[PDB]
Amino acid sequence: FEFEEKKIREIMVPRTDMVCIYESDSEEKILAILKEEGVTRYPVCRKNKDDILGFVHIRDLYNQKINENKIELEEILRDIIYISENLTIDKALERIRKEKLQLAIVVDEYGGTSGVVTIEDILEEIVGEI
Amino acid sequence: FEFEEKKIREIMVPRTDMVCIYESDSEEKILAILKEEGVTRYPVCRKNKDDILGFVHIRDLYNQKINENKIELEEILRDIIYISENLTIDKALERIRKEKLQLAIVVDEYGGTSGVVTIEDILEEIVGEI
Numbered sequence: 001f002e003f004e005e006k007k008i009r010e011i012m013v014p015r016t017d018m019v020c021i022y023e024s025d026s027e028e029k030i031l032a033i034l035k036e037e038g039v040t041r042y043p044v045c046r047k048n049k050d051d052i053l054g055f056v057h058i059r060d061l062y063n064q065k066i067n068e069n070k071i072e073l074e075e076i077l078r079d080i081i082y083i084s085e086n087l088t089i090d091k092a093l094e095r096i097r098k099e100k101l102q103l104a105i106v107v108d109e110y111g112g113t114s115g116v117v118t119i120e121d122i123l124e125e126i127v128g129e130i
Numbered sequence: 131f132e133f134e135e136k137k138i139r140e141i142m143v144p145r146t147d148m149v150c151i152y153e154s155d156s157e158e159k160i161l162a163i164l165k166e167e168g169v170t171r172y173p174v175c176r177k178n179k180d181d182i183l184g185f186v187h188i189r190d191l192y193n194q195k196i197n198e199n200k201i202e203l204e205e206i207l208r209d210i211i212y213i214s215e216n217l218t219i220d221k222a223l224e225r226i227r228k229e230k231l232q233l234a235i236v237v238d239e240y241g242g243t244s245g246v247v248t249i250e251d252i253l254e255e256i257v258g259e260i
Contacts, residue, residue, distance in 0.1 A: 034254070058250060058253075062250070062254065063253070065257050066253065066256055066257055066260065120170070120188060120189060123188075123189065123192035123193070124164070124165065124192065126196055127161060127192050127196055130196065130199060
């Protein structure tokens with residue numbers, strides 16, 4: 001019940017803690033962050049965290065590097081959806097479920113990135129209330 | 131180069147640290163461990179960690195519970211492969227890549243479970259050496 005009134009803002013990884021791979025990051029930096037972080041899907045940014053280009057999956061990154069000794073982000077870049085931070089957790093699931101994606105960029109009232117949230121984060125929260 | 135002589139034993143989650151969902155676990159216990167552990171794919175065991183039935187993915191578990199208020203493991207159970215702990219990391223990748231799976235149960239010289247290893251664990255190790 002509590003997740004019908006509860007906003008996505010409450011369970012997102014906030015902008016400051018979100019890890020973006022920037023298109024200009026070195027390959028060394030990318031592997032260093034994939035290794036430290038325990039995470040499978042990374043948003044890719046141009047310049048700043050408000051210009052999201054899409055996301056990438058860790059397996060794709062590693063297969064590029066292993067097979068060719070070069071990471072080409074554009075060739076493995078996968079689409080994201082944007083949702084408002086005032087969307088309730090249940091309508092978020094409905095939405096992301098409908099679009100067939102696992103990852104949402106969460107957007108503030110000024111059209112900036114306020115954070116990021118995963119389909120699992122959202123299911124984890126809902127099954128909580130049941 | 132070092133991963134051509136290096137065994138899977140060296141990068142597996144060992145038996146003792148591996149988390150198995152047992153077929154007889156309560157639903158409460160399952161959600162409690164999915165929540166604490168930061169992990170997407172869980173082996174399912176009957177009785178002990180040497181009788182692996184397959185594995186399950188966290189999204190499937192959560193969708194069962196949310197949609198029906200009941201977890202039925204058999205209906206979401208996905209196949210695993212077994213590899214020897216003396217397989218080298220490169221032949222492990224070849225093997226798991228060939229079978230189209232993301233998760234291997236690693237087996238000792240007595241036919242027991244010595245641990246578990248993921249495709250990402252293995253790519254993470256290989257790109258290390260390059």
